[PDB]
Each structure stands twice: as structure tokens, then as C-alpha cells.
Amino acid sequence: PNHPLWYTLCDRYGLYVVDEANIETHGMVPMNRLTDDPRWLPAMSERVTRMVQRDRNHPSVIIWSLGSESGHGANHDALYRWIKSVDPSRPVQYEGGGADTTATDIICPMYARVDEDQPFPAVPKWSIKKWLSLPGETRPLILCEYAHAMGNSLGGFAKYWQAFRQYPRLQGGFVWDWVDQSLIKYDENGNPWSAYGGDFGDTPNDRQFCM
Amino acid sequence: PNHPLWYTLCDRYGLYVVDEANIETHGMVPMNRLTDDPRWLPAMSERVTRMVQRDRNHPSVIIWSLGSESGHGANHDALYRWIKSVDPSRPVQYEGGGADTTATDIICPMYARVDEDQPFPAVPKWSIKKWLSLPGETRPLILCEYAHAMGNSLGGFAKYWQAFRQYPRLQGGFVWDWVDQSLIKYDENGNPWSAYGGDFGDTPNDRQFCM
Numbered sequence: 347p348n349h350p351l352w353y354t355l356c357d358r359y360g361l362y363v364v365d366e367a368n369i370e371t372h373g374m375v376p377m378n379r380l381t382d383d384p385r386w387l388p389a390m391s392e393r394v395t396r397m398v399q400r401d402r403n404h405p406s407v408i409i410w411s412l413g414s415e416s417g418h419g420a421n422h423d424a425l426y427r428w429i430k431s432v433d434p435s436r437p438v439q440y441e442g443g444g445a446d447t448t449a450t451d452i453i454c455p456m457y458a459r460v461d462e463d464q465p466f467p468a469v470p471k472w473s474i475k476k477w478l479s480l481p482g483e484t485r486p487l488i489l490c491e492y493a494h495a496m497g498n499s500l501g502g503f504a505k506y507w508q509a510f511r512q513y514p515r516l517q518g519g520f521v522w523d524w525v526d527q528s529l530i531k532y533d534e535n536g537n538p539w540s541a542y543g544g545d546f547g548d549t550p551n552d553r554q555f556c557m
Numbered sequence: 558p559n560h561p562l563w564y565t566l567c568d569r570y571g572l573y574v575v576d577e578a579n580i581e582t583h584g585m586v587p588m589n590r591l592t593d594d595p596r597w598l599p600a601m602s603e604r605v606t607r608m609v610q611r612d613r614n615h616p617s618v619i620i621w622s623l624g625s626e627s628g629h630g631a632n633h634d635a636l637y638r639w640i641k642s643v644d645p646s647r648p649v650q651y652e653g654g655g656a657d658t659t660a661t662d663i664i665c666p667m668y669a670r671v672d673e674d675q676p677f678p679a680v681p682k683w684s685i686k687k688w689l690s691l692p693g694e695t696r697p698l699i700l701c702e703y704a705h706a707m708g709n710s711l712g713g714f715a716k717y718w719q720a721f722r723q724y725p726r727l728q729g730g731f732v733w734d735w736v737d738q739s740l741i742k743y744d745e746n747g748n749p750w751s752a753y754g755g756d757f758g759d760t761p762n763d764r765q766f767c768m
């Protein structure tokens with residue numbers, strides 16, 4: 347969840363917002379170790395319920411999100427249903443555990459490609475055109491993250507837009523991402539320079555991956 | 558419906574067969590002028606019912622078809638349902654009126670392209686990949702006709718097969734078609750030559766479109 351003023355601004359300037367619970371357990375092995383564990387349900391629920399309680403009157407928020415990169419656990423399913431009872435007015439999405447689980451109203455993969463399948467075991471990233479028509483699948487597909495803009499990037503961006511325009515159920519997505527997470531440091535002459543991971547003696551770090 | 562031996566041979570050699578009622582009204586304006594007319598329902602029904610009564614014991618027949626290029630009329634709906642009641646063991650298909658009407662269990666377009674849309678009014682031919690994922694569509698897609706093999710043709714055939722293999726609900730199709738409809742004539746030396754439309758003093762005619 348963001349600074350309160352963000353929603354006010356999006357309400358007034360006009361931006362659709364996906365409001366996302368502060369839950370990410372990416373580093374767990376496997377990724378759902380905590381989110382499938384009933385002992386973590388209370389800490390998890392507070393992160394979801396207190397978000398909804400805070401932001402549910404903002405017109406800009408059109409979609410609720412259960413968080414990011416925490417696999418798919420039973421806690422997700424419980425919290426999905428909690429939102430659906432409490433606030434039927436907005437769809438709930440969540441990418442974890444394969445982007446098309448029972449905890450999401452929207453097929454919301456990250457970095458699924460337009461035409462090329464990436465058949466990873468358990469959590470494949472189908473071509474978004476193919477994903478739509480898998481046997482029994484009926485939901486819309488909006489990419490929660492796509493077109494990783496790291497450095498000299500965004501090659502093949504037009505391919506996504508052509509597909510979005512041709513397919514009714516391909517309804518767009520969210521680029522990753524808006525702003526480089528570089529921080530200012532100063533050299534000996536007091537001159538500013540953009541720093542990334544490692545430049546603060548931080549180790550282990552992931553270098554330029556923050557940009 | 559074919560010569561009775563054809564089915565016996567498909568039974569024993571192993572080919573899947575689409576058995577098709579002898580109904581085509583292509584030259585009507587509009588195409589369904591007769592098939593939407595209840596006065597022509599008796600004649601159409603005999604063409605459908607007497608086929609089922611003849612061929613329903615052949616294992617090689619796996620799909621019934623209501624006929625060919627006759628638009629979509631109410632008579633098709635009624636006869637679709639007749640077959641569904643009398644023989645539940647086989648799907649019913651029909652391409653008329655846009656290939657996805659209420660008279661077909663199978664989206665069965667003719668010459669629908671792989672990636673390219675052809676948005677004709679009333680009866681569009683969507684890209685087959687797009688067609689599957691149209692809002693609310695669930696049915697399998699098998700082209701009743703594709704890859705028109707007229708003269709030096711079959712350019713782009715590989716494109717179909719790549720897509721058939723990638724998309725579960727793209728379950729293939731039926732090439733148009735098996736054998737040139739040329740006839741033998743004889744020159745003044747008595748040597749045979751391949752003749753087509755117009756070569757018998759037939760007028761008007763559609764020339765080589767029979768091959």
C-alpha cells in the first residue's frame with residue numbers, strides 16, 4: 347500500500363490503481379513456505395484486511411492485489427475470499443503460484459511472452475495468446491508485470507500492443523517499471539553520482555538489478 | 558454422403574470420417590434463403606435423417622455435418638437438435654453462417670488464417686488463435702476447410718501446423734482438397750488431355766476452379 351496522498355492524486359488526475367498488500371516472501375524455499383502455513387495466516391490477513399479497510403473508498407483503486415511473489419498457499423485462497431465477501435465491487439488478482447490459480451479473478455502473469463511459451467515446470471509462462479484459450483479458461487489476461495525496462499531495453503514492446511489490440515481478452519498490463527532505484531552518493535569533490543547495489547558496502551547485493 | 562463402400566474401407570484401414578448431408582445452397586441470395594424457410598425443412602430433414610439412419614453403425618464416422626455453404630437458417634438448428642437426440646455418440650458440425658453458430662459443436666471455419674483476421678461483416682473469419690479466446694467461447698476449433706491447394710499452392714502450410722501443435726484447442730483441419738476435378742478429353746490424334754471448366758461448351762463456367 348502506498349502513501350495516502352497517492353490515491354487522492356490518482357482519484358483527481360485519473361489513473362486506475364491496483365492496490366497491493368505488503369506481502370512478499372520471494373526468498374522462501376519453496377516460495378509458498380509461509381503462505382501455505384496456517385500460523386502465518388494472522389500476520390498475512392492483517393496486511394490484506396487493513397489495506398482494504400483503509401483504501402476502499404478511493405475510486406482510483408479498481409483492483410485488489412494479495413501481494414507479490416509468495417507462491418500460492420491456502421492463506422491466499424482464504425484472503426481472496428475474504429475480500430470477495432467484504433468488497434464485491436473490485437476484482438482480486440494475484441500472480442503467485444502460476445498466475446491463474448483459484449486466488450485470482452484475472453490471469454496476471456509476469457513476463458509471459460506474446461508468442462513464445464516458457465514451459466517451466468509447475469509455473470509455466472504460456473504465450474499470452476495461448477493462455478487465454480487453454481481448455482476451460484475464461485478469465486481476462488492483464489500482465490501484472492511485462493517489458494522489463496532494465497537499461498537499454500523495451501525491445502519487442504510493439505509486439506505486446508499489437509496483441510493487446512487484436513485480442514479482446516488480452517487487456518494490457520503493467521510495465522516493469524517506472525523509476526530506476528538508484529541512490530545519490532558523493533565523490534571526494536562533493537559531486538553527485540548514481541549508485542546501485544554494492545556501493546554502500548552492502549553484501550550480498552544484486553548490483554544494477556535495482557534499476 | 559459417399560458410396561457405401563467408402564465407409565467400410567475407412568472402418569478397416571483406419572480414417573476418421575466427417576459424414577456430411579447432401580445440402581448446399583451456395584448460389585441463393587442470401588445464402589440461407591432456403592434453409593431459413595420452413596417449407597424447405599422437410600426436404601432438408603430427409604437429407605440429414607436418412608444419412609444418419611444409413612451410416613450410424615460405422616465406427617469411422619466420428620462427426621456428423623449438416624451440409625455445406627447454405628448460410629445459417631432455423632432448419633439447421635432443428636436438424637442439429639434432431640441428430641443430438643437420435644445419436645448422442647457423435648458431435649455435430651456445420652460451417653454456415655459464420656462457423657460458430659448454435660448449429661455446430663465445433664468451430665469449423667473455412668480458410669480462416671493463422672494470425673491474420675478477415676473481418677467480413679456478419680460472417681467474419683477470425684485468426685484461428687484469436688477465435689478460440691473470444692469472450693465466452695469454449696469450443697474446439699477444427700477447420701472444415703483450409704490451405705486451398707489450387708495449382709501451385711500450400712504456401713504457409715507449416716504456419717498452420719505450428720499453431721495446431723501449440724494450442725490445445727486448435728485440433729487441426731481438413732485440407733481443400735484431395736484430387737483435381739479435371740476430366741479426360743481427346744485431341745485429333747486420340748491422345749488424352751486434362752480438361753476443366755468451359756472445355757465441354759459449358760457456359761457460364763468457372764474454368765480451372767474445379768482443380
Ligand code: NA
Binds near residue numbers: 510513514517518
Ligand atoms: Na484487448
Ligand code: NA
Binds near residue numbers: 556557
Ligand atoms: Na529489480
Ligand code: NA
Binds near residue numbers: 721
Ligand atoms: Na492442438
Ligand code: NA
Binds near residue numbers: 766767768
Ligand atoms: Na473449387
